[PDB]
Design an enzyme around this catalytic site. Structure first.
Site, PDB file in Angstrom:
ATOM      1  N   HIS A  42       7.087  44.730  19.245  1.00 60.89           N
ATOM      2  CA  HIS A  42       8.206  45.498  18.721  1.00 60.89           C
ATOM      3  C   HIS A  42       9.367  45.553  19.703  1.00 60.89           C
ATOM      4  O   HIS A  42      10.489  45.841  19.306  1.00 60.89           O
ATOM      5  CB  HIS A  42       7.776  46.904  18.305  1.00 60.89           C
ATOM      6  CG  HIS A  42       7.704  47.888  19.438  1.00 60.89           C
ATOM      7  ND1 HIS A  42       6.512  48.344  19.954  1.00 60.89           N
ATOM      8  CD2 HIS A  42       8.682  48.546  20.109  1.00 60.89           C
ATOM      9  CE1 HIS A  42       6.751  49.211  20.926  1.00 60.89           C
ATOM     10  NE2 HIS A  42       8.064  49.352  21.034  1.00 60.89           N
ATOM     11  N   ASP A  91       7.015  45.235  11.589  1.00 58.72           N
ATOM     12  CA  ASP A  91       7.918  46.138  12.296  1.00 58.72           C
ATOM     13  C   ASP A  91       8.010  47.509  11.623  1.00 58.72           C
ATOM     14  O   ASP A  91       8.494  48.471  12.220  1.00 58.72           O
ATOM     15  CB  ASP A  91       9.308  45.520  12.465  1.00 58.72           C
ATOM     16  CG  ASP A  91      10.167  46.297  13.445  1.00 58.72           C
ATOM     17  OD1 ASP A  91       9.704  46.527  14.587  1.00 58.72           O
ATOM     18  OD2 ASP A  91      11.292  46.705  13.084  1.00 58.72           O
ATOM     19  N   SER A 191       6.443  51.159  26.393  1.00 61.94           N
ATOM     20  CA  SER A 191       6.030  50.158  25.410  1.00 61.94           C
ATOM     21  C   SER A 191       5.831  48.833  26.037  1.00 61.94           C
ATOM     22  O   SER A 191       6.670  48.382  26.771  1.00 61.94           O
ATOM     23  CB  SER A 191       7.083  49.928  24.341  1.00 61.94           C
ATOM     24  N   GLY A 192       4.755  48.162  25.660  1.00 65.76           N
ATOM     25  CA  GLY A 192       4.503  46.818  26.121  1.00 65.76           C
ATOM     26  C   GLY A 192       3.702  46.735  27.402  1.00 65.76           C
ATOM     27  O   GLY A 192       3.105  45.692  27.696  1.00 65.76           O
TER      28      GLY A 192
HETATM   29  O1  LIG Z   1       7.008  51.215  23.335  1.00 68.33           O
HETATM   30  P1  LIG Z   1       8.254  52.145  23.413  1.00 68.33           P
HETATM   31  O2  LIG Z   1       8.571  52.686  24.859  1.00 68.33           O
HETATM   32  C1  LIG Z   1       8.110  53.560  22.270  1.00 68.33           C
HETATM   33  C2  LIG Z   1       6.997  54.538  22.534  1.00 68.33           C
HETATM   34  C3  LIG Z   1       7.261  55.882  22.350  1.00 68.33           C
HETATM   35  C4  LIG Z   1       6.281  56.832  22.580  1.00 68.33           C
HETATM   36  C5  LIG Z   1       5.005  56.466  22.963  1.00 68.33           C
HETATM   37  C6  LIG Z   1       3.986  57.540  23.172  1.00 68.33           C
HETATM   38  N1  LIG Z   1       2.778  57.301  23.543  1.00 68.33           N
HETATM   39  N2  LIG Z   1       4.298  58.782  22.953  1.00 68.33           N
HETATM   40  C7  LIG Z   1       4.733  55.106  23.137  1.00 68.33           C
HETATM   41  C8  LIG Z   1       5.724  54.149  22.930  1.00 68.33           C
HETATM   42  O3  LIG Z   1       9.535  51.295  23.022  1.00 68.33           O
HETATM   43  C9  LIG Z   1      10.864  51.547  23.281  1.00 68.33           C
HETATM   44  C10 LIG Z   1      11.660  52.157  22.319  1.00 68.33           C
HETATM   45  C11 LIG Z   1      13.007  52.379  22.584  1.00 68.33           C
HETATM   46  C12 LIG Z   1      13.570  51.982  23.789  1.00 68.33           C
HETATM   47  C13 LIG Z   1      12.783  51.364  24.749  1.00 68.33           C
HETATM   48  C14 LIG Z   1      11.431  51.130  24.486  1.00 68.33           C
END
Ligand SMILES: *O=[P@]([O])([C]C1=[C][C]=C(C([N])=[N])[C]=[C]1)OC1=[C][C]=[C][C]=[C]1
Length: 241
Positions: A42, A91, A191-192
């Protein structure tokens, strides 16, 4: 990471920072060989203002500790040659949220740069198990990212419980990890990045990939992660790793 603490320098040498052109750190990734990273699909989806799917518009920082010190000893900077997102990635639901990133030139392993072992297809990380999340994401919901890599210990949640906490949102590709009491969780910008399962005898496996959540660190809203063992053959097929 909300509710975590500063990592030691070089403590998570498989953790990578992915910056999109002109935007700084956006997502994490993990080093799995000299040429390949694992991350979340994503992160690499276009929006109206920017082609996140374009591999040339990314920079990977390997061996990074502090986002304000990207030319420090130990850092290896790389471009991406390609982004292989999972064919079944959706997505809308974030099912199959995993991608493979090929570095333009290989990393050289060092004290600060080292790969994490993949789990084989039969590997299980049972509900209850304490494992680690790391990243430079927000340290509070709605907050701002961390300069210094953060770590937090979190627990695998039972899948039926997970499904019910986040109804009509969880697939078998996903795992909830956190605490039902909240407090420690991944958050935007994590993320990632990897879940790292650290065993007593030093065995370390990547258990999953940071994917999504409902808020951050809220009670009964643990983070959701992509399960990694189910993707072992896909990774081998597409990368040779
Ligand atoms: O993978 P991300 O950081 C989004 C996300 C939000 C919250 C959790 C959690 N465990 N509460 C996990 C992952 O992706 C993004 C989104 C926007 C900007 C940068 C990275």
């Amino acid at each position: 990471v909300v509710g975590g603490t500063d990592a030691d320098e070089g403590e998570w040498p498989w953790q990578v920072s992915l910056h999109a052109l002109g935007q700084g750190h956006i997502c994490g990734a993990s080093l799995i060989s000299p040429n390949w990273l694992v991350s979340a699909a994503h992160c690499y989806i276009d929006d109206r203002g920017f082609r996140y799917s374009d591999p040339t518009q990314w920079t990977a920082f390997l061996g990074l500790h502090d986002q304000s010190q990207r030319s420090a000893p130990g850092v290896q900077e790389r471009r991406l040659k390609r982004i292989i997102s999972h064919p079944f990635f959706n997505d809308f639901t974030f099912d199959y949220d995993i991608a493979l990133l090929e570095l333009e030139k290989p990393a050289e392993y060092s004290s600060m740069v080292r790969p994490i072992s993949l789990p084989d297809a039969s590997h299980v990380f049972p509900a209850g198990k304490a494992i680690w999340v790391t990243g430079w994401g927000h340290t509070q919901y709605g907050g701002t990212g961390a300069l210094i890599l953060q770590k937090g210990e979190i627990r695998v949640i039972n899948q039926t419980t997970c499904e019910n906490l986040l109804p009509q949102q969880i697939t078998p590709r996903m795992m909830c990890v956190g605490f039902l009491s909240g407090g420690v969780d991944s958050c935007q910008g994590d993320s990632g990045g990897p879940l790292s399962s650290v065993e007593a005898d030093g065995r370390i496996f990547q258990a999953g990939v940071v994917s999504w959540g409902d808020g951050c660190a809220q009670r009964n809203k643990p983070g959701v992660y992509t399960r990694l063992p189910l993707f072992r053959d896909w990774i081998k097929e597409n990368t040779g790793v």
